[PDB]
Design a protein around this ligand. Sequence first.
Ligand SMILES: Nc1ccc(CNC(=O)NCC(=O)N2CCCC2)cc1
Length: 164
Amino acid sequence: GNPLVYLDVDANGKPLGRVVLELKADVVPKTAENFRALCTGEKGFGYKGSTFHRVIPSFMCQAGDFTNHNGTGGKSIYGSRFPDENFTLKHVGPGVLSMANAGPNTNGSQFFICTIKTDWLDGKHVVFGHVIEGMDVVKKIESFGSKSGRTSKKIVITDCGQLS
Ligand SMILES: Nc1ccc(CNC(=O)NCC(=O)N2CCCC2)cc1
């Protein structure tokens, strides 16, 4: 069925624990496949070692720029960017996993995990999964953000991969 993947996350070099994500390949197979492969690193690049570079309390935690390591970069397994697959899934609440972007059809590798319902992003960001386990870890990450998005600890995905 739908892939289960994980992110193991450090803050200032010490482990917070594991976030487990279900990828909704049934609804958004291309977007789910991209994220899955970036977790395993099987194409020779991916999320391992990359950061949560911008985190805003009571909103979301954003990550996945493994090319420029500053929020301007990332790439997909298909090429630098790929289209918005569909907007069928909605930003319904905490734990939603969705693609960051720079406008229409600019999905790469950057993603975010919501910590609240973010309805204004519906129709603009492709939702492609949800947290299965580890919301406690997500709340810790969230607690290290700020209004400007700047993090107060260095938040690193030390390991990631596929569970099923
Ligand atoms: N592929 C790609 C994706 C994102 C960017 C830079 N864009 C962003 O940080 N956009 C903000 C964004 O998507 N957000 C922030 C609310 C969580 C969703 C640049 C390239």
